[PDB]
Paper text:
NME1/2 are hexameric enzymes that catalyze the reaction XTP + YDP ⇆ XDP + YTP by first transferring the γ-phosphoryl group from XTP (usually ATP) to residue His118, and then from the phosphohistidine to YDP, where Y is any of the four common (deoxy)nucleosides. Briefly, each NME1 subunit within the D3-symmetric hexamer comprises an antiparallel four-stranded β sheet flanked on either side by a layer of helices.
Efforts to cocrystallize murine NME1 with the ligands led to high-resolution (1.96 and 2.2 Å, respectively) crystal structures of NME1 bound to SucCoA and ADP, and a somewhat lower (2.6 Å)–resolution structure bound to CoA. ADP is sandwiched between the αA-α2 helical hairpin and an α3-β4 loop segment called the “Kpn loop” that define the enzyme’s active site. Of the 10 direct hydrogen bonds mediating the NME1:ADP interaction, only two are conserved in the NME1:CoA complex. This is notable because the ligand-interacting residues of NME1 adopt nearly identical conformations in both complexes and because, apart from its 3′ phosphate group, the CoA nucleotide is otherwise chemically identical to ADP. The CoA 3′ phosphate group forms direct H bonds with Lys12, Tyr52, Asn115, and His118 as well as water-mediated H bonds with Arg88, Arg105, and the Gly119 backbone. Similarly, the outward shift of the CoA β phosphate is accommodated by water molecules that satisfy the H bonding potential of residues Arg88 and Arg105, which, in the ADP-bound structure, directly contact the β-phosphate. Compared to ADP, the α and β phosphates of CoA are displaced upward and are solvent accessible, pointing out of the pocket to direct the CoA pantetheine end away from the protein surface. This contrasts with the ADP-bound structure, where the β phosphate is buried deep inside the protein and folds back toward the ribose 3′ OH group, with which it forms an intramolecular H bond critical for catalysis.
Numbering used by the authors:
A (entry chain D): 2 to 148
B (entry chain F), D (entry chain C), E (entry chain A): 1 to 152
C (entry chain E): 1 to 51, 65 to 152
F (entry chain B): 0 to 152
Amino acid sequence: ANSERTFIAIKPDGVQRGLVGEIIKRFEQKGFRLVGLKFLQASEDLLKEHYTDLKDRPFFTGLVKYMHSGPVVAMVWEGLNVVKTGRVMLGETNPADSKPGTIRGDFCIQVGRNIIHGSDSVKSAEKEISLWFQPEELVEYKSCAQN
Amino acid sequence: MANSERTFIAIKPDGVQRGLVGEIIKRFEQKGFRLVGLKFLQASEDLLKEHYTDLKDRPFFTGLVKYMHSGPVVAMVWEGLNVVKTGRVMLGETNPADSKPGTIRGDFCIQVGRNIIHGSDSVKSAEKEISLWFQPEELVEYKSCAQNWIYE
Amino acid sequence: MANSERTFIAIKPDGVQRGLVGEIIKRFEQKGFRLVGLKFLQASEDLLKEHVKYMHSGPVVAMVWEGLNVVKTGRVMLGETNPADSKPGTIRGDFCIQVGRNIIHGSDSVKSAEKEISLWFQPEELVEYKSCAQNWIYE
Amino acid sequence: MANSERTFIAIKPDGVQRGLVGEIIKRFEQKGFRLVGLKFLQASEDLLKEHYTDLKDRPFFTGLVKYMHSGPVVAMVWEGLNVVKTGRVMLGETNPADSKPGTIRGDFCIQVGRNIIHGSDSVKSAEKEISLWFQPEELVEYKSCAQNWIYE
Amino acid sequence: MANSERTFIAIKPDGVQRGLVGEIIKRFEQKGFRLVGLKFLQASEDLLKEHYTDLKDRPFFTGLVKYMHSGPVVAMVWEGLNVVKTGRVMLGETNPADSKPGTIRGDFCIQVGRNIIHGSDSVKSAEKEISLWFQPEELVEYKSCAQNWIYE
Amino acid sequence: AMANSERTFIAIKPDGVQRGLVGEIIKRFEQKGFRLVGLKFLQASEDLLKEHYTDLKDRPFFTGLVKYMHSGPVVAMVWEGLNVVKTGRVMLGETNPADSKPGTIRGDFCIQVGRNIIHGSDSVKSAEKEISLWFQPEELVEYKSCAQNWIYE
Ligand SMILES: Nc1ncnc2c1ncn2[C@@H]1O[C@H](COP(=O)(O)OP(=O)(O)O)[C@@H](O)[C@H]1O
Ligand SMILES: Nc1ncnc2c1ncn2[C@@H]1O[C@H](COP(=O)(O)OP(=O)(O)O)[C@@H](O)[C@H]1O
Ligand SMILES: Nc1ncnc2c1ncn2[C@@H]1O[C@H](COP(=O)(O)OP(=O)(O)O)[C@@H](O)[C@H]1O
Ligand SMILES: Nc1ncnc2c1ncn2[C@@H]1O[C@H](COP(=O)(O)OP(=O)(O)O)[C@@H](O)[C@H]1O
Ligand SMILES: Nc1ncnc2c1ncn2[C@@H]1O[C@H](COP(=O)(O)OP(=O)(O)O)[C@@H](O)[C@H]1O
């Protein structure tokens, strides 16, 4: 359980508003280990697969186009309960319901521009990780402290 | 439009005296709200009693006005989607002991009589407080750049 | 005297070794509590504080903070005892992962605070001073 | 009287647009200077040409006034010992590429035409800038509790 | 054209291990530079020997390569006016003891053998280092909204 | 060899404490990589302060300096690291805060030379004198951190 991994993606608005370092800092100071990190403009096919459970939803077409309008930071973090805690750190889906102290609570307002994505479960994490990262891009090392 | 709601935020004299003006403003800037009005003044007793007119019959009303008059305040107007209620969440609760960490009052103050900040509790009180503290000429209009990334 | 309530906060070795001492003290200063005691030591015979090896393996920063409801609010600022339910914005919510390797301790109650303060601090180490912003904190 | 020196500090439109108002204010508050005046406005073209009258024959003067008029600015007056000279040191240099890390311009901007902030370069120019931008009632007098620990 | 200059910035393994990645990135974001490339990897010894090829005859070369290979590094490309020279200024000096407070090396490290960050020293070095560490398809290309307020 | 075990004495003056800057100052030394060795909180007596500032006893500001340093509690610290004495002074700034640059403690947080919030040993000689004056040897704690492997080669 100490080696659980989650997928975190900084959406284009978050990149455009200069929030990459702030977001990464919150995961670092929390104690989670950085495993994968890349910067890319996600293709429309990749995004449709990423949000496949929401294709019939009314906001899907605009969601895929907005996630394609700019580059994203794709990340993998490792640690105990990182999936659930990552979701807690992110906030709620609607930033209006995200508490102060959370990433979405502190830094954004509207649900269509909520700066960050996080996996909802281990099953979604393993699917998102293998979708966004090849296995050789995931680094394994012993981060300090921890123990 | 919904993305044009406005609220009134005031940094109370204890928040100014303790050097919290920048910290408070920064929270509204980084959240994505747009600064519309900003002034710095020592509010008169008449202005404060009209501001707190719904509390005229509370036992703490006289002490409230005297403390709000004991020093300068920062009066502000912030604009954005749901800015009134979201502003209240960012401030915390009336009693800072009920304000959770991460809120302005939860992080920076202790006692209900010195809660450093005020925020409009409703849209109707907001426009009432805005017009009370600001003239229409003092409210600035500008399209910031990141609104394409703040709103759809 | 209401505003004169005191609590005992201890930074455990993981907090010290991860460089969080100043960050933790800052959260109490910016909140408005008054620093009363502050010392640095490797603790032995910790069998009185608890009712032991990890607290003896390294250094502990022991503090005494004063203010209205400092015991209750101090525990709010630390976060829940498990870091998995601790909210972002709290000390444990921001910096802590698991329960065993905890970074910080805070007094459970006023009665516990009085006991822990008397055990860890001599009376000569508790400094009384009037801070300037305390009349802007209290009514 | 030396501890009562005042300077004029203005956050330019790019500074407001990029959300640096609270950050800039925080640096002056944490330094120990006293906030005296604070207002938010879109400066008229006459006010800006008067503000930059010593540069009217420069090739960039026209673009400077237009850019300064392109958005709202935050006008400020700060008080303290050597606040004019120290204010310039905290801002950095005219070209952000010459501004050192730790200063406002060094930390936050890149090119001279977009250097987010203005500060008076002398007591004389500060006196003129403060009168040009502020009315006398907009300057607030108060004693902060910090001053006994800031000045001997 | 000048505003499209690019530099290579690497966070060294000690910087990654001490939890400084976000701090370092934030200094480049808040300054106004545009992130162009970003990757996380454990660099091979041959990559590291080519990167520091001008130092192959230095007595510390073997220890430098081993240390740079002992953990994963964060590789980055940043774009902006004078980003190469300004990146050096933000980094500090080779010896952290000569790096001023406010710089990355001056704030965050102590020993020359563990100075947490690398940055290109020249435009020629940056072009060599960028193509050494990145492939062209990894260099992302976009119009940051916050760019009409950074550049004239 | 033991160059990384050099120690300095840093004291947060009463104005630094009263203005709520204790956490800010400690953080700068922590994030730099220096190791906290000693830490205490006390209202230093006049006899202690006069010994601490003995080289200044004939200066015009000596009596005011001792009185102000006694008017409230100070945070006394010992920090350890390579060249921590000289580097600590750089992190502090100059005697006059008006000559202290942004990014330094005195440059960011204070204004006047008489209220410069912090003290730091000006030499290795001064440091061992100041450390023993304010601290007994059993108050100096020993530990090694995970970061030491990444701060020093
Ligand atoms: N009502 C909506 N309008 C526009 N976009 C939405 C709406 N609801 C969700 N989205 C977008 O779809 C993304 C995925 O939503 P979902 O997976 O249900 O929540 P979460 O973001 O917590 O995983 C969100 O990040 C958001 O940007
Ligand atoms: N019991 C009390 N004693 C002293 N002051 C109080 C008390 N209750 C409220 N106040 C002050 O009156 C102000 C207005 O009260 P109210 O509008 O009910 O709270 P809020 O400001 O959270 O909306 C508060 O900001 C607080 O500073
Ligand atoms: N060569 C230039 N190109 C574009 N803008 C300039 C140039 N020189 C100065 N400016 C702008 O005009 C303002 C006033 O210039 P000056 O008073 O000399 O600098 P400072 O504001 O640092 O005192 C500057 O802050 C800068 O924004
Ligand atoms: N004297 C030295 N001893 C050990 N390592 C060194 C020494 N000089 C340089 N290095 C290492 O080699 C790297 C490259 O050296 P150089 O290119 O001269 O410095 P810079 O990184 O400042 O451009 C440095 O960042 C440092 O980590
Ligand atoms: N001219 C002065 N007036 C008042 N106090 C002073 C003056 N010069 C120095 N002091 C105080 O005495 C302390 C010791 O001075 P000194 O050791 O020479 O400087 P530093 O503290 O930078 O080493 C200073 O930190 C300062 O607080």
